[PDB]
Every structure is written in structure tokens, then in C-alpha cells.
Amino acid sequence: LKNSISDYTEAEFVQLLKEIEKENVAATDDVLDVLLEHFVKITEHPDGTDLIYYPSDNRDDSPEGIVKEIKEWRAANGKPGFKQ
Amino acid sequence: LKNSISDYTEAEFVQLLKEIEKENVAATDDVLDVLLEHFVKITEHPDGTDLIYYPSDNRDDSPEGIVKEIKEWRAANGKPGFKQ
Amino acid sequence: LKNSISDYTEAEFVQLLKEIEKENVAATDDVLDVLLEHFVKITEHPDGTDLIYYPSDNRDDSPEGIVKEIKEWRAANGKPGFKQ
Amino acid sequence: LKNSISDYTEAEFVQLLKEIEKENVAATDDVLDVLLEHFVKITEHPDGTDLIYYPSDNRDDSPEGIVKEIKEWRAANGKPGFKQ
Amino acid sequence: KPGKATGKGKPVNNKWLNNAGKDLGSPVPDRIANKLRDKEFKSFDDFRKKFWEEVSKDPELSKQFSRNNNDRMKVGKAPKTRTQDVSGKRTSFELHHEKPISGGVYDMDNISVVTPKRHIDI
Amino acid sequence: KPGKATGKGKPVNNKWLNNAGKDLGSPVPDRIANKLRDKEFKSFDDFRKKFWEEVSKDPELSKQFSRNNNDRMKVGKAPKTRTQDVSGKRTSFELHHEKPISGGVYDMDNISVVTPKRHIDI
Amino acid sequence: KPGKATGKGKPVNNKWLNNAGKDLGSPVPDRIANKLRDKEFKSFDDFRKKFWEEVSKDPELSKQFSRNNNDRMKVGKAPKTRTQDVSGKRTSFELHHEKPISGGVYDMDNISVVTPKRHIDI
Amino acid sequence: KPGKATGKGKPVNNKWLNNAGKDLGSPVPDRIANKLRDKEFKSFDDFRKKFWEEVSKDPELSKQFSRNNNDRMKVGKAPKTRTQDVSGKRTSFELHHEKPISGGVYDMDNISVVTPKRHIDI
Ligand SMILES: [Zn+2]
Ligand SMILES: [Zn+2]
Ligand SMILES: [Zn+2]
Ligand SMILES: [Zn+2]
């Protein structure tokens, strides 16, 4: 769990999303909610978890779609992107 | 890793599928391939991993769709289903 | 994560302890601390996490030692033990 | 799973060992055995898994002890060590 | 305590939970009631779990949720609400009883789905 | 050893890998070549990883694969082939050089995608 | 098939498995037999699991194994053998019946612990 | 901001942190200072991480901690304190500067280890 989007390559952020998907189906949300808090903190997107649970119909509801939307928003707001 | 489809509730099989999804994006397939061998062995479906990587266009490409197809096939062939 | 010591076989509680050991060496304590809160809640031992990080010199500092101390304390206080 | 000891910092190798410890207590050895094969391959120690299951009485039976023995052996044989 | 589910619920559109943060929230879908009716549950929690799992199996309702929320319901957990409808640690849809113990615990006609924000106001 | 990618590849339909188990297999998509051309790679393995990641970013190609295979490519791994096209431990599409070292290691026009079964026959 | 454990086993030193790769291997510890005697098991596998768990609980025997092997036995799995005693995929101590079905499946006096290498020779 | 570690610390007994919840807490071990002296760190956090890792490598100090706490320090994290010395979310030993910015950020002689409870009182 890095404390900055700049520390994540696109592939590593996808791994983070699949870890969240695994906790989604776990018995409880104890672990899930901690991963989501981290996701919201580093992404800095105003809609937070909506990127995961309420994806825009204008893009794919997939780990790849989530990364693309984050990339576009952070770029449009002059924020550092994923680690190249 | 139970050694029988009858030991898995539908929810638990979904957890197995999300574990496979996590290994899908891991650096290597070392762990993934072991989980897939197990998946093929307990499911007993002739198409094996195709249920995961080559889903029929007549059903959803999701953990839920995979479980439904397995349920329908095992029932149609007189094989025990998921643990109720 | 069951919400009762009675739902755990001794082997399953050991798995819980090894999961905690894995998070112990993770980059941060975000996940670790949630597992520890759960551990303290179900065990009901007044010393809480001390059973893990400050084991009595009168027993083994191992997953097996932790389970034995918990078993002895819960039995001595008339509380339900591990699932047989 | 890196394919070289030089890609692992001492802390990261410890994480690898705790992952092995977790699989040690899993229901089966399917995953465990793959992690062990990887461990044996990158370490290149002739005794392989003995470093984990049959530690010398001249050092600690702990993740830290395992790393130290590997460091000493690879250094004594002119092999590259952990990533600094 | 245990009991059996009763009730008929109500027909819903393709925007079932759109009004979960208003008034008494969204009702129990009649197709869902048909699957849960006359079934015994050890507790309301057991009911809540079976409820969401049933929602994940109804094609008309599952299509109204994202892939991540569908996975949540498939294992018996309530779907996450929108960020704007959360309140503290409560971040998922909750079931609310119209007529409290003062009852009908398993009365699907006395049960509805509401957001955390709205539930607190109630 | 390192080098730079060169070549133009070829235009492909919505069934790109349908003929990966026949003849020399499927060619490098021209849109993919455009993204990899003139880029340096430390090894062919590095090329292979970047190749698949590029495929996952091309909407016209990603739609030809399932969600699980798209995730594989997104991290640089080759997609899994159909069960019928596997051979032992080799269960994913492989890159084959038409003209071996006897060369063009990064020559996208001398590279193609083939299934394990077909690769062994070659 | 199911059955009940019988037998007395034999007293062992602080090097119980030192001779597991010779002759018929190491015998069932008498202290272990005392804990398993007269107990019913659904299969030999069930017996094998309970066997190792009992070994992990005996202070005199657990001290003869490393921390990693103790964790294995604690969950019913056989301890790993030394690298020199393995044979292919068989890397853990195995239970061998002296008198086969030609019997005594749960007869602890007809059961012993042997290494893969030695078991194959037998 | 970055800087270099300086100082000599102090000799400690086999109960180094026994007084971490009193006065200014426990001092930086002189053997630890010898390993960190003259080394550059990007931040105090970087120092804190290297500090604990060094403690895990000192046989005289590591033996004063349990196996779980040793693993924590091995990766740069502070050991967990006793339940009685925690305070809210702060459950691990903290480093305290005697003379604040009003300084010596990397001055090991101006740094000590204290428990959450005691740190708050300070
Ligand atoms: Zn209510
Ligand atoms: Zn070739
Ligand atoms: Zn035999
Ligand atoms: Zn301070």
C-alpha cells in the first residue's frame, strides 16, 4: 500500500483493484473498507469509491476502465499520474 | 482447496474464482496454473479453463455467469451440484 | 473472519494467526490492525494483543502456544472453546 | 515472484518466507510446493528446503535466521546477494 | 429470533434504488418476495444475506448494479451506496422496518431499503 | 540482448487469433506496430510484455478477449489459449520468429502469434 | 472405509524419525497410540490427519521438529522430509502398512512412518 | 528534509524499553548509533525505518522481543507496545525529540523511544 498514485505503475494499480475485488466477496468488509479508504486517499477523486461501484456508462466497468478514468481526471487537473 | 464441487457453496466457489482473478494479474502464472488445474479437476467440464477465459456469448462473462453454466452442465449430466 | 471463538477449529485459528504474521511484515499496519482488533474481540482476553506480541515465558512463542494459552484461559473462565 | 535473489531486499525475502508459512498451514500443499520450488531455484543452496524445515542448531529458526544463513552462504560462494 | 418471511412486496422499475434516500426508501421487489416467501430464517441478518443473494440472481435487478456490487450481493452483502449517500462507517444500503417492535420482523411488506443518510434522518 | 522494434505489421479483423494454430499463425497488428515502432527493449521478453500490454489498450483488439484474458494482457502476460490448443505446461499464446537466428529479433514483420500445438509442429 | 484405531505402538527416543529411511521405518509412538486408541475415523486419510495433529500436541515430539514443520502437523499435514530423502513430488513423510490388504488398516502396530525414497524401495 | 545521523547514544541493559513510559523514555542504544552514525536519510521516517531494522540485527536487542515483534522491526516497523501502554490508534513505540524545532532532527542524542500513553503526557 503505497501512499501516492505516483508510486503505482498501471499494472500495480490493477493488482490493487483485484485485491479489492477479492475482499468484495469476503465474509465481511473489515479488510475491504481499509483498502477502499486507501484507494480514495491516493486517487483524490471527489467521487471516491463511485469509480469502482458506480462506473460511468461512458467507459468500461473493468479494472482497465477504472485506471483510464483516473488517468484522464488526474491529467485534466494537473496531478501526477501513474509511475511510468 | 476442497477436492469436490459438492464441498463448495455458490458463494465459496465465487471466492475461488476471485482468487484466480487475482493470480491472473500476478507477475507470473506459477500460482495461477495450480489454481486452474484444481478448477478443472473439480468442475469436470470437458472444456476446462474455457469456462473462465472463453465464456459463451449466451451468458455473462462474470463469476456469477461461470457458476450458473457449471450448475446447468453438472445438473444436465447427473452430477452433484454446489453445497446448499 | 468469524464473530466467535466457537466458530474456529484450532487449525483455523492457527490460519488466522499466520495471516496476522503475514501482515506483520507488510509495508503498513492498515490491514494488520483490523485483524488484531478482530483477534482481540473474539478472544476476550484482557491482555488482548499481548498474547501475540508479549507471550508469557511459561509457554512457547508460537501459533501453537497462543492457542493453548487461549484454550486454558477461556476454559478457566467458563467460556466456550474452539469448535471441535 | 522475482527470478533472482538480487531482486529481493532482505525485507521482501522475509515477506516471501511469511507467505510460505501461511501456505504451510493451508489445507493442501498445492500452492506451498510451488512457492518452495521457487525458493529453491533462486536461493541455489544445495540443501534447498532444509533451510526452512531443518535449520542448523547454530542459528535461529526464524525468517531472520534463514536470511542470514542464505546471505553467508551466497557470499562465501561468490554469488550476488540481496538487493541493497 | 427465527421466523418465516411473509408478504408480497411491490413491482419495481429499472431504477429500483433511485429513491432509497427519500421517504421510506425502496420496497422489496415482488419477484424477490416470491422467492423468499414461506422460508425460515434464524435471524433478520440471515434474511438480509439471503435477500441480497436473491437480488444477484434476478437478471432484471442485477443489471441495475455494477460488476463489483453484483459480486457483493452474490455473497450476501448489501451493495455499496454512492459516496454522497454514506454516513461515517455506514457505506452500504440498509434494511429499515417501517413498524418497529412497538412489529413484523420478517414481514417483507414492512421492510424497505434505505441509504445511511436517509436512515439517520428517519 | 536489447534492441529496437521495427516493422509495420498487418491489418487484422475482429478474429485476429482465429488462425493462430495454422501455418505461421497470426501477424502483429499494424496499430500495435505503430505504438511499438522505434522503441528500445532490453530483451525479447521485455518486448513480449510491452506487446500484450499494448493489445489491452487497443479497443478494437481488447473486445476480442474475455475479461480474464484482458486482465492478463494488462500486466504483460499472454492470453490463455483454448484448452484444445494447449500442449502440456504451455497454455498461452506464444510469439514465433519466422526467420530464426540462422534473423531479426525485434522485427515485427518476422514475428507472429501461434498456439502451443501449432508451434510444436513448426 | 471407516474404522477404529487399535494398538499400543512403541516407546521412542528424541530422534524418532532418524531411521525412517531404513527397514520398515519409525513406529507409532506409544503416547500417540494412547490418544488415538478406540477412536473412529472415516478413512485412513482422516487417521493420518489426526495422527499428525496429535504429534504437534506432544511436547516430547514437537520439540524434535522445526517451527515450520510443527505448523504443518498442527493442521494435520505430514512434516516435510529432508531434501535428500524426497522422491519427485513426494516430499513429506508417509505412513506405510507392514501387512497390506493381503490386513489391519487402523492397526497402529501395523503402521509406520517412512521417507519417500525408502518407501519406493519397499 | 534529509540529513545525516549523529550522536553516540547510550549503553542499555536487557530491559531496554522497560522505562519507555516514564520521563523521556528509553535512549538510542550506542551499538545502534555506531551503525547509523554518518549515514544520510531522506527524512526522519527513513531514519525510523532503518533504526528498527538495525535493532532486529543486534542479537542483544532482538532477544528482548518476541518473534512477532522481531518480524515487525525486520521490515522497518516499530514494535507493538503492551496493551496497557497504547492510546487509541497509536499502538506502537514512537520516537520523541527532546529538543523540538524550537533542534537536531537526526541527533541520536536528542532522540528517545517512548510509549503512546507517555508521549501524550509529554
Ligand atoms: Zn430502521
Ligand atoms: Zn519459434
Ligand atoms: Zn505402504
Ligand atoms: Zn515528540
Swiss-Prot record, chains A, B, C, D:
CDD domains: Col_Im_like. Gene3D superfamilies: Colicin E immunity protein. GO terms for molecular function: toxic substance binding. It comes from the Bacteria. Pfam families: Colicin_Pyocin. This protein is able to protect a cell, which harbors the plasmid ColE7 encoding colicin E7, against colicin E7, it binds specifically to the DNase-type colicin and inhibits its bactericidal activity. Dimeric ImmE7 may possess a RNase activity that cleaves its own mRNA at a specific site and thus autoregulates translational expression of the downstream ceiE7 gene as well as degradation of the upstream ceaE7 mRNA. Belongs to the colicins ColE2/ColE8/ColE9 and pyocins S1/S2 family. This is Colicin-E7 immunity protein. It comes from Escherichia coli. The gene is imm.
From Swiss-Prot, chains E, F, G, H:
The gene is colE7. This plasmid-coded bactericidal protein is an endonuclease active on both single- and double-stranded DNA but with undefined specificity. Colicins are polypeptide toxins produced by and active against E.coli and closely related bacteria. It comes from the Bacteria. Belongs to the colicin/pyosin nuclease family. This is Colicin-E7. Residues 58-107 are annotated as: Disordered. Zn(2+) binds at residues 96, 119. Residues 87-100 have a biased composition (Basic and acidic residues). The chain holds residues 449 to 572 of 576 of the full protein.
